[model samples]
Target: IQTNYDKVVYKFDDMELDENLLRGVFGYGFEEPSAIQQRAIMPIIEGHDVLAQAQSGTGKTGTFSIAALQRIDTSVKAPQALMLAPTRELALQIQKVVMALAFHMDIKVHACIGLRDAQIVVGTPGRVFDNIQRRRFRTDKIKMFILDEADEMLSSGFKEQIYQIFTLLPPTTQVVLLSATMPNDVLEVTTKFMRNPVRIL
Candidate 1:
């Protein structure tokens, strides 16, 4: 279903984010939420699957990072969230954002180029899937599954890997897909994995 941005929160405080996360948002120099951030963050934080159409430099990373950080249980000390990007560079960038946003929250965010242990794991599909297969990264506790640059990932032959990884996740995992463009094939595949996701344009 399409989301009405008019009803979404415009400011960080208005979003009622965790106090530490709110401090991180302002500390990261983001005075306000971008359009996509305004429309997508709350639905994600509320535990709904989301399909967001956002271009580069629109703060899409921050959108998912904030929601992911807000939902993670810092005390759990396990893989509570998984963020898959198309490349190592993108994965590292997301890890950085998550770390910055979680600076005061006592959470651990790791880039799974290979990880020992972390609450939030960010990595490319290949490595992430391999880690899952080898038991290096656990999926049982993962509540949030985010895919960034999804169009590129799907178009570049990562669909099967993505599908396999999805099958490994818990049944209650929340899926969030973000991309500059959403092709018919991408939407089709997402439907197979997501459950009534909110579409934010």
Candidate 2:
């Protein structure tokens, strides 16, 4: 049986994350937590939905990536998460970060980009659900689900697609919604689909 992390305040230390996941954010010149990263990681890790508002490139990727990596059962064989993006490019970005975080753990996390389905999926809503219908992946194991680019996913006529994708995920999974701003439709999705969504400063 899968375990639920009920404990709060996950201590950050050398043993908390995999080494490859730590692949030198410092070497990459990450001196300190960005305004968003510093503010957002914990709530998301605590099984809460975060409607994070921040600059487009303010290390949002790593923040969600690290949080997602922590929930994954490195021993599981199937995909334990889905990092759904609004573009092929962003999907690739999420997949790369997933790979980096799961690196030292030695797991083969696959990207669902370009209409390809794998255990760990990452792609736009349309393609992400298409694979789901084909049974290329299972939603039950998806513990960490991130919806990157909230407004785009809505204005581009993807709200239903988002809804469909949500139905596939296990009810217990954490939903992390990140975007540049909180729009009406994005707010609607969170209000309807999420539980106790906290905003990141």
Candidate No. with top TM-score? 1
Q: Candidate 1 residues 100-159, lDDT tens each?
A: 888888998888773555898999999899988989967788999999999999998999
How many clashing residue pairs appear in each of the predictions shown? 0, 0
- Stretches off by above 4 angstroms in model 1 are 1-6, 114-116
Model 2 lDDT per residue over 59-105, tens place: 88878877777666767767777877778898887777767566566
TM-score of each model, paired residue for residue = 0.95, 0.84
Task: Indicate the residue-level lDDT of 117 in model 2.
Answer: 30
lDDT of 2 at 30: 48
Candidate 2: regions farther than 4 A off: 1-20, 23-29, 114-119
lDDT of each prediction vs. the true structure? 0.87, 0.70
